[PDB]
Amino acid sequence: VKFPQLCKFCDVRFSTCDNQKSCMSNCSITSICEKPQEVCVAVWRKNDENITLETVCHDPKLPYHDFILEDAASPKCIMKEKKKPGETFFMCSCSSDECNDNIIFSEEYN
Amino acid sequence: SSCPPLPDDETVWYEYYGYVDGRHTVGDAAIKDSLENYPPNTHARRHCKALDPGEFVAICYQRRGTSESQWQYYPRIASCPDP
Ligand SMILES: C[As](C)(=O)[O-]
Ligand SMILES: C[As](C)(=O)[O-]
Ligand SMILES: [Cl-]
Ligand SMILES: [Cl-]
Ligand code: NA
Ligand code: NA
Ligand code: NA
Ligand code: NA
Ligand code: NA
């Protein structure tokens, strides 16, 4: 039977992650997801004013920020860019413990 | 591989049950081991002393294929209010 997994779960934080092939979440909160079926998510967003990194659990049967978590079965968080007006937006999901702690932007790093 | 009872205070106490499926369903009373510790998959139910049926807040979580177990908490937990 599916048990809940562990994820970084700081919600939305300001971030200094920028211009890197990978970033650590710098999130000090690891949580067990409320629901067994939830997976980990990281969302990085940059606009003219701020950079944020969001870390949550989320059920991949539901969209998140208007996108489907097609990568939920991955063990690693590989960020994928979504085209959005007025910001640069990257998101990943993954289903190993604390997998949204190690956020990978460059293909080169897996 | 076990978890000690959670520390408590004037705001809170805990009961312990086996995890079933989800954060709502209450399982059997959890059984302590010889060192008075709870086994992996124990579900900790908190009661705020100021106030409610109780709410599960943590699982004694054993990592994947390891022998290390620690309490892991559900998201966004807020402290019980002071009495
Ligand atoms: C980020 As959620 C647990 O409300 O799907
Ligand atoms: C987590 As995805 C496939 O919407 O970048
Ligand atoms: Cl964009
Ligand atoms: Cl476990
Ligand atoms: Na859109
Ligand atoms: Na843009
Ligand atoms: Na973008
Ligand atoms: Na509960
Ligand atoms: Na919750």
Author numbering:
A (entry chain A): 45 to 154
B (entry chain B): 16 to 66, 71 to 102
Task: Reproduce the article's own wording on this structure.
TGM6 is a natural antagonist of mammalian TGF-β signaling produced by the murine helminth parasite Heligmosomoides polygyrus. It nonetheless retains TGFBR2 binding through domain 3 and potently inhibits TGF-β signaling in fibroblasts and epithelial cells, but does not inhibit TGF-β signaling in T cells, consistent with divergent domains 4/5 and an altered co-receptor binding preference.
To identify the underlying molecular basis by which TGM6-D3 binds and recognizes TGFBR2, we isolated the TGM6-D3:TGFBR2 complex using size exclusion chromatography, screened for diffracting crystals, and determined the structure to a resolution of 1.40 Å. We found one TGM6-D3:TGFBR2 complex in the crystallographic asymmetric unit and interpretable density for residues 46–153 of TGFBR2 and residues 16–65 and 71–102 of TGM6-D3. There is a single large interface between TGM6-D3 and TGFBR2 with an area of 661 Å2. The interface between TGM6-D3 and TGFBR2 is a remarkable mimic of the interface between TGF-β1/-β3 and TGFBR238,39, with a central hydrophobic region flanked by hydrogen-bonded ion-pairs at the periphery. On one side of the interface, TGFBR2 Asp55 and Glu78 form hydrogen-bonded ion-pairs with TGM6-D3 Arg95 and Arg38, respectively, the first of which closely mimics the interaction between TGFBR2 Asp55 and TGF-β1/-β3 Arg394. On the side of the interface opposite the TGM6-D3 Arg95:TGFBR2 Asp55 interaction, TGFBR2 Asp141 forms a hydrogen bond with the phenolic hydroxyl of TGM6-D3 Tyr80 and TGFBR2 Glu142 forms a hydrogen-bonded ion-pair with TGM6-D3 Arg82, mimicking the hydrogen-bonded ion-pair between TGFBR2 Glu142 and TGF-β1/-β3 Arg325.
